[PDB]
């Protein structure tokens, strides 16, 4: 009579498993949740330094514009990447279309 | 594959299913192979009713105390059981391997 | 070993409603930082 | 019977004239030279 | 294993709150860097070449 038939019931296992199964379930969309977070810091990055690049570039040309050499440094330049850039985005809405 | 915890669960009522015999065991066998398998599937069944996993999902345990005997689904839900003549084909289904024509009007009665 | 997996499941739920704070202080932070940078993207295309 | 230990250090091993009981205890390092620098909620259950 | 996956999500996300934070600095930067810059393209637009 001292040796118990079950340690517990049933009821205290099934909502052990059920707490079990929740967390898991939680802690997998928390997971997805971060790594998806991480992916938008990684592009907001990758934004703020092409925003960086911009900024410096649209510096180098605004001081650049009021020098006399510009003139003639243009005029011997064959290719720009403003240019290249904006024909090449003409180009692909042009095929698309 | 709409929940996210019933594959084990599908999984044994499938080898259940497997392990009970048909049509092959009895008949135009023997039909003492097919009491002794039908026995063996029903032991079976109450070992994996009272080793612990069905205590989780009240439809699936329902479903596996049905298929043991008791009746104390159908005796709530009568409603939904249609009538006597089902209800008494369901109990030769369940526990009625061999039916006696005594026996078979006893249990009618 | 119940015992211990009480205390263990308890311990997890309230780090449970840490993490979910956690995680709202993290969305928020995000959204300052996307409305930021989408202040920042429509400045340099009204430069441009 | 005696006792051993993995090569590994991860593994403690009750070895006795009727079978082992393997029982999984993490590294100690870090804080009080506890598990993983403060842990007591790991596996710690014996297998035959 | 709920254990471990929980301390693995909370330093991660501890590291993402850190990066956020330094990012958030950055573009702040950014923006001050980028205020005074804004005036000086409106004026230079005017200056039209004949």
Known sequence: SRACFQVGSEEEKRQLRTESDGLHSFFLEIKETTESLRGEFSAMKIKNLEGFASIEDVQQRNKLKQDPKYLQLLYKKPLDPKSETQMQEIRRLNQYV | STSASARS????????????????????????????????????????????????????????????????????????????????????????????????????? | QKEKQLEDLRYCREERKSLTETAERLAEKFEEAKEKQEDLINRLKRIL | NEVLLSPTQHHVALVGSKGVMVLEIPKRWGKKSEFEGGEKTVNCRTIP | TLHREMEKVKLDQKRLDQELDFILSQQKELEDLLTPLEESVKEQSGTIYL
């Open chain 2, 9 to 109: 669960m599908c999984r044994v009522l499938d080898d259940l299913l497997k392990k009970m015999p048909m049509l092959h065991t009895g008949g135009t066998q023997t039909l003492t192979e097919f009491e002794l398998k039908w026995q063996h599937w029903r032991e079976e069944c109450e070992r994996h009713l009272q080793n612990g996993t069905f205590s989780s999902n009240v439809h699936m345990e329902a479903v596996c105390r049905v298929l043991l005997g008791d009746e104390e689904v159908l005796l709530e839900k009568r409603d939904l059981m249609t009538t006597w003549y089902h209800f008494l084909v369901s109990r030769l289904l369940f526990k009625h391997p061999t039916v006696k024509p005594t026996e078979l009007h006893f249990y009618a009665q």
